[PDB]
Design a protein around this ligand. Sequence first.
Ligand SMILES: [Zn+2]
Ligand SMILES: [Zn+2]
Ligand SMILES: [Zn+2]
Ligand SMILES: [Zn+2]
Lengths: 22, 151
Amino acid sequence: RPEIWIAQELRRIGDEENAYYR
Amino acid sequence: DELYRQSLEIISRYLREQATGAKDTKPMGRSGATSRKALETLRRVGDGVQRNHETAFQGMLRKLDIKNEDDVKSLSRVMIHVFSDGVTNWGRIVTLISFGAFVAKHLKTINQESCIEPLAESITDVLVRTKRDWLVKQRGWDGFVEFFHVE
Ligand SMILES: [Zn+2]
Ligand SMILES: [Zn+2]
Ligand SMILES: [Zn+2]
Ligand SMILES: [Zn+2]
């Protein structure tokens, strides 16, 4: 549950960063 | 396994740099040019992610509740889970590395004899082992450098 939330954040931030540089 | 060696080095050096705050002066050795540009790219975008997502990172570090330098099992499950949707991009990859550095910093405070090595190995293991062919197709760390190359 905490680990799922952490995964959600990293994924959200990761894709957001990807889009920016893309 | 050069891909793994190179990856572990770039990721280890960045984490160690972040935790100790001191740059390392050693020849990268093999494909040194790429590795240095990777470390440079990693400093720029890596520090940026930590700055721009300090609030989220602090919360994540809190829920992780990492007890020691060897307690990387949970983070490993987290990183695997991040890619469990089948999506792979450099944005996610560099974010995991940036958070790794954020964790490495916290480890120092609680004890200063912490190798960042176990942490760097956990991150490198996930990336290189579970995304082996994706990385190779992207020309490894040159693809990394290229993607984050800004004008
Ligand atoms: Zn961002
Ligand atoms: Zn140890
Ligand atoms: Zn293969
Ligand atoms: Zn240019």
